[PDB]
């Protein structure tokens, strides 16, 4: 008495702000084009809106409406 | 209780010369005066141990001890009432 996203080869999207999620804009299975805002996360006087790295079809969203996330966390995976 | 270490002391009212307050977090090592006593100015009335260091608490004037809020081996906190004099 959250898994961490990979930051080398596999094209996941890792958290770069250690704060909270404000808005989830993408669904479990969705078509998404270049630079489409998919995640809106908030810190103290900061705000990162997560863009798309390339194009692809989003196969998973690992964050809900109002979740605390750490640096380098699994949020999206795209191919 | 089994000793008197759970006992909560009232806070000394700072703008009253009768009230003597604890200056630091310490331990009461030796009580030297009781309720209803009269000794000169500078009388060593209480012996605290701050942190391995020892200071006697002295009376600011002449007068009669109305209350002693502590017993031997009692813990104290900053601003705790210890003694009242007249």
């Amino acid at each position: 008495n959250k898994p961490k996203a990979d930051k080398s080869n596999p094209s996941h999207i890792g958290a770069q702000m250690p704060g909270s999620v404000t808005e989830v804009k993408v669904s479990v299975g969705e078509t998404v084009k270049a630079n489409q805002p998919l995640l809106i996360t908030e810190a103290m006087k900061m705000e990162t809106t997560i863009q798309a790295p390339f194009d692809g079809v989003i196969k998973q969203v690992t964050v809900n409406n109002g979740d605390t996330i750490a640096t380098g966390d699994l949020l999206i995976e795209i191919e | 209780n089994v000793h008197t270490n759970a006992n909560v002391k009232p806070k000394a009212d700072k703008s009253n010369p009768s009230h003597i307050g604890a200056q630091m977090p310490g331990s009461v090592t030796e009580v030297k005066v009781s309720v209803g006593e009269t000794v000169k100015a500078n009388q060593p009335l209480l012996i605290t141990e701050a942190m391995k260091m020892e200071t006697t608490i002295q009376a600011p004037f002449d007068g009669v001890i109305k209350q002693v809020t502590v017993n031997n081996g009692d813990t104290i906190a900053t601003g705790d009432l210890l003694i009242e004099i007249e």
């Binding site: 770069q16 702000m17 250690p18 704060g19 270049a34 630079n35 810190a43 103290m44 006087k45 900061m46 705000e47 990162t48 809106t49 997560i50 863009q51 790295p53 640096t71 | 909560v8 009232p10 806070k11």
Partner: protein, 541 residues
């Protein structure tokens, strides 16, 4: 306003502008000093500074902080201090077209804000643009003139004019042209905002001297004491003929704050110009703020000695304790020295720019973001094509914060914004005028009754923050009136507290005990309010 400027020139004494109510605590205590504490010594302050030029007691970070963290209305701080201090001019720091926020707003917003600020009691508006771009200051200036109040136009200092190798942009010549430009716009007073305490003593002499014979405007010098040379800078400033300086009371002075008024008063003993003020009384103020400061130990910065390395990273003094709190909340507590090393790096990455609010905020956001992800400068030369940046840092390369003298590097910029792109004009002239009528309606709906002009631009300046303040007010009433220790810590068993509500009206609350959490996590607090048994049940979190 015209006349007040003329009167300042005739004055041979040095005129003092106190910053205890605004910039001193913005520098030292992450801006958290509450109204209650100011309102308590307002009468004494009114006397001590009866001869001062102004009191800087509004604007800057206080608008955000009051509504946000302190859950108190900054408008109420203003009006109350106004009524309490009718003799001395009130000064507030205004961020050109960013007003009291972090990007540019539509011009009708800045206009409305100044109209309400002036109406509610502000007298001197210190306008400044974080890129020293005069075009951005015109709107604010026009609004201030129209209000019949004093317009102070600022140049923000960077680099070292004593050092040609530091920069061939920010030269003595740079400042003279910029001052002369501010004179034609009809600003009443010229201000030198040395935000990062970069103005070396010799440089201030050389700088004020040139300006003093380049323009007729009275010169208001503002610096921070971060180097430890603040007093020297002022003494030299005074020798070259400066008209007003910004000082703080001894116990709210030094390090990241401004130099000590108290120390200065004596510094000029035996010298030609002395300081126009009451020392016996400033000691009183110092003793007061000495204790009050104690209430805010939780907000004290890391620094406790003068720092000469500030000549390297150029972090603004009024950013220092606020960005120490941001880093702390962001997992970067302890690691703040690495946050300062790259704040220097970020600066040269952007081509040596002016760093004040909000341009400092962007360098600050770029510093916090790169240090979190272990990112270097060369990690963007060909590798920027993906990263995902903070809103402020992309906003800067879109030009929502203006245009820096030296622009940006095309290739440097592109990799950050790709999608849409750069806008070249000062945002005010394309951004459409905000509908204040629709805003009136919206607030008239959520709340159901009387809503003021202050409410309206407050909400336009700060949507989420304002809304949340209203949420809190509905729940907990007016918190301004609680003393600070009670505001931060609540109450101790057997403690009694007086809350002053109005003249002859007070709340006598005694907390008897708190019960154990019942089978719902609800504890019972036994109170006694104004001689009346009372029970309050609180969810234990």
């Amino acid at each position: 306003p015209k006349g007040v400027a003329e009167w300042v020139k005739k004055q041979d004494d040095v005129l003092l502008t106190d910053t205890t109510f605004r910039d001193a605590h913005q520098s030292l205590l992450a801006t958290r000093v509450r109204t209650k504490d100011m309102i308590n010594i307002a009468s004494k302050t009114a006397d001590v500074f009866k001869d001062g030029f102004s009191l800087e007691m509004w604007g800057g970070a206080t608008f955000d902080v009051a509504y946000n963290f302190l859950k108190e209305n900054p408008w109420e701080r203003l009006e109350r201090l106004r009524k309490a201090i009718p003799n001395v001019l009130f000064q507030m720091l205004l961020r050109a077209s960013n007003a009291v926020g972090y990007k540019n707003y539509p011009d009708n917003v800045i206009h409305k804000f100044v109209q309400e600020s002036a109406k509610a009691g502000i007298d001197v508006f210190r306008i400044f643009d974080s890129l020293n771009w005069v075009d951005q200051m015109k709107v604010a200036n026009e609004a201030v003139q129209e209000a019949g109040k004093i317009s102070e136009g600022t140049i923000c200092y960077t680099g070292d004019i004593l050092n040609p190798e530091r920069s061939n942009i920010y030269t003595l010549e740079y400042y003279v042209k910029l001052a002369k430009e501010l004179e034609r716009e009809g600003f009443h007073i010229l201000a030198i905002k040395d935000m990062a305490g970069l103005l070396k003593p010799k440089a201030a002499y050389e700088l004020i001297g040139e300006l003093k014979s380049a323009v007729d405007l009275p010169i208001h010098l503002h610096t921070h004491d971060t180097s430890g040379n603040g007093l020297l800078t002022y003494k030299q400033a005074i020798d070259a003929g400066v008209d007003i300086i910004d000082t703080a009371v001894a116990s709210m002075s030094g390090l990241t704050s401004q130099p000590s008024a108290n120390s200065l008063y004596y510094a000029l003993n035996g010298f030609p110009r002395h300081l126009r003020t009451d020392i016996e009384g400033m000691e009183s103020l110092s003793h007061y703020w000495s204790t009050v400061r104690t209430y805010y130990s939780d907000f004290e910065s890391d620094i406790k000695s003068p720092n000469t390395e500030i000549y390297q990273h150029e972090m603004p003094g009024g950013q220092y304790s606020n960005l120490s709190q941001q880093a702390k909340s962001l997992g970067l507590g302890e690691r703040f020295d690495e946050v300062k090393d790259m704040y220097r790096r970020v600066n040269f990455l952007f081509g040596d720019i002016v760093k004040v609010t909000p341009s400092s905020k962007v360098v600050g956001d770029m510093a916090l973001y790169m240090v979190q992800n272990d990112l270097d400068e060369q990690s963007v030369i060909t590798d920027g094509y993906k990263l995902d940046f903070p809103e402020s840092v992309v906003s800067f390369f879109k030009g929502e914060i203006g245009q820096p003298v030296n622009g940006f590097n095309k290739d440097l910029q592109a990799v950050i914004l790709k999608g849409q792109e750069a806008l070249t004009a000062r945002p005010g002239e394309y951004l459409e005028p905000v509908d204040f009528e629709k805003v009136r309606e919206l607030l008239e709906e959520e709340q159901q009754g009387p809503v003021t002009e202050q409410d309206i631009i407050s909400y336009v300046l700060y949507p989420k923050v304002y809304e949340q303040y209203i949420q809190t007010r509905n729940q907990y009433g007016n918190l301004s009136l609680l003393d600070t220790p009670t505001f931060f810590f609540g109450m101790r068993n057997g403690e009694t507290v007086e809350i002053e509500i109005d003249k002859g009206k007070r709340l006598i609350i005694k907390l008897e005990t708190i019960s154990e959490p019942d089978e719902n996590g609800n504890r019972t607090i036994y109170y006694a309010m104004n001689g009346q048994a009372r029970r309050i049940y609180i969810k234990d979190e």
